[PDB]
Write a protein that binds this ligand. Structure first.
Ligand SMILES: [Ca+2]
Ligand SMILES: [Ca+2]
Ligand SMILES: [Ca+2]
Ligand SMILES: [Ca+2]
Lengths: 14, 91, 88
């Protein structure tokens, strides 16, 4: 997913 | 807690209700995912009643190919349902 | 009762409680997001500088608004944090 990728990106930022 | 906090807590708890049944207590295998969809998301399961269709849904959710749906994959699933329903809110 | 379907309905409706105040009625600007976080997710919270780095992070397409998809990505991440605690 684009969504799975986006979740991984954000989780590593928060 | 406030409604949205409780919604987050239900997301987490509902996943473990099913993931802890068999094998890896932290991932959903095919039987666990099926039981979660049928009991917990009956409004949204329609086409997926067919076994091949359910296995297709499952293979789309399982984005890291390890045969199970982990919590991140399950959140993406729920977010896709929310985005589906939101189309209807926006009109 | 289907608590997960109720959860899903709250996830959608809560966004629209705030996104409609200003600008695009389907996106949260920084003011609308601060309201939403303060009022609906208080356990996850803070200075204005803190609201800004959080805004930056949520707004992954850099348009200065948080749209529904970005908001769901955020809620997934918060659920994931709670899950990591739950798992031990
Ligand atoms: Ca399991
Ligand atoms: Ca997987
Ligand atoms: Ca707005
Ligand atoms: Ca944005």
């Amino acid at each position: 997913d684009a969504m799975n990728r986006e979740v991984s990106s954000l989780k590593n930022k928060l | 807690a406030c409604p949205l906090e409780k919604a987050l807590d239900v997301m987490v708890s509902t996943f473990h209700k099913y993931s802890g049944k068999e094998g890896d207590k932290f991932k959903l295998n095919k039987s666990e995912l099926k039981e979660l969809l049928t009991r917990e998301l009956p409004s949204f399961l329609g086409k997926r009643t067919d076994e091949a269709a359910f296995q297709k849904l499952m293979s789309n959710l399982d984005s890291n190919r390890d045969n199970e749906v982990d919590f991140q994959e399950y959140c993406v699933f729920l977010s896709c349902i929310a985005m589906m329903c939101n189309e209807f809110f926006e009109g």
